[PDB]
Amino acid sequence: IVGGYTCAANSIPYQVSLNSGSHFCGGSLINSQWVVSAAHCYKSRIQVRLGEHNIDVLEGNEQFINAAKIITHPNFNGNTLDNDIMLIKLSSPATLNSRVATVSLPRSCAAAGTECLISGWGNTKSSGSSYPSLLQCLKAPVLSDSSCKSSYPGQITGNMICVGFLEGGKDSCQGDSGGPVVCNGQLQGIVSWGYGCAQKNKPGVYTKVCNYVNWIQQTIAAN
Numbered sequence: 001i002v003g004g005y006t007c008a009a010n011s012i013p014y015q016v017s018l019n020s021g022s023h024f025c026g027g028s029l030i031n032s033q034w035v036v037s038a039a040h041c042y043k044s045r046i047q048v049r050l051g052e053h054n055i056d057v058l059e060g061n062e063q064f065i066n067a068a069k070i071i072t073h074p075n076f077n078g079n080t081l082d083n084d085i086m087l088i089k090l091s092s093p094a095t096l097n098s099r100v101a102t103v104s105l106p107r108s109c110a111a112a113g114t115e116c117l118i119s120g121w122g123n124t125k126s127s128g129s130s131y132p133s134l135l136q137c138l139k140a141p142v143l144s145d146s147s148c149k150s151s152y153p154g155q156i157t158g159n160m161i162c163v164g165f166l167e168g169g170k171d172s173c174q175g176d177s178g179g180p181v182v183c184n185g186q187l188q189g190i191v192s193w194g195y196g197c198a199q200k201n202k203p204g205v206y207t208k209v210c211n212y213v214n215w216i217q218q219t220i221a222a223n
């Protein structure tokens with residue numbers, strides 16, 4: 001997250017870190033047994049780390065739970081990143097407490113200008129790189145579909161929303177992929193892509209979660 005702030009410890013209790021030797025992607029706890037993330041984050045083995053704030057220190061709230069099943073959306077396009085969504089079933093249920101909690105799926109798609117919270121452990125620099133130990137947070141509005149498509153002519157599918165600031169300076173970045181965009185207590189976005197990070201007129205592009213409620217419920221009932 002570039003241009004954000006360090007979240008209060010454990011204030012984003014649905015945020016997970018996906019770990020394969022190190023942190024490589026974010027995800028969102030949506031059921032005691034399931035995490036939603038970005039299909040482009042796929043690996044065949046993943047440890048899910050819940051209740052993290054400092055991914056470099058054991059602070060006593062962590063639950064480390066291996067993935068038992070990893071299911072990419074059947075229409076995920078690895079090139080365009082259309083349908084950039086996957087579900088991870090935990091090998092044992094997360095225990096839900098103040099620091100490890102589910103986030104709701106969308107009632108409806110978020111209107112333009114809806115305020116959200118974006119989080120993760122991705123790069124904090126727009127010049128160079130710095131990877132944080134502490135979870136970063138960013139307040140950001142959903143952008144109009146017109147703004148989104150004007151920034152990325154021909155590239156925004158119906159499964160993509162833009163969230164952020166057309167001026168630059170405030171965006172998600174590499175290592176945030178798969179993590180949450182939460183607006184009014186609902187998961188509306190998954191960190192997906194952007195052209196570099198925090199550039200002028202290149203806002204962050206996020207998987208449009210409100211399109212996937214059927215798929216997610218279907219997948220949970222089937223597995």
Ligand SMILES: *[B]1(O[C][C][C][N]C([N])=[N+])O[C][C]O1
Nearest residue numbers: 172173175176177194197204
């Ligand atoms: B993923 O990259 C996310 C980049 C988001 N960029 C942006 N909002 N301008 O994180 C690790 C793998 O891809």
Ligand SMILES: [Ca+2]
Nearest residue numbers: 054057058059
């Ligand atoms: Ca920790």
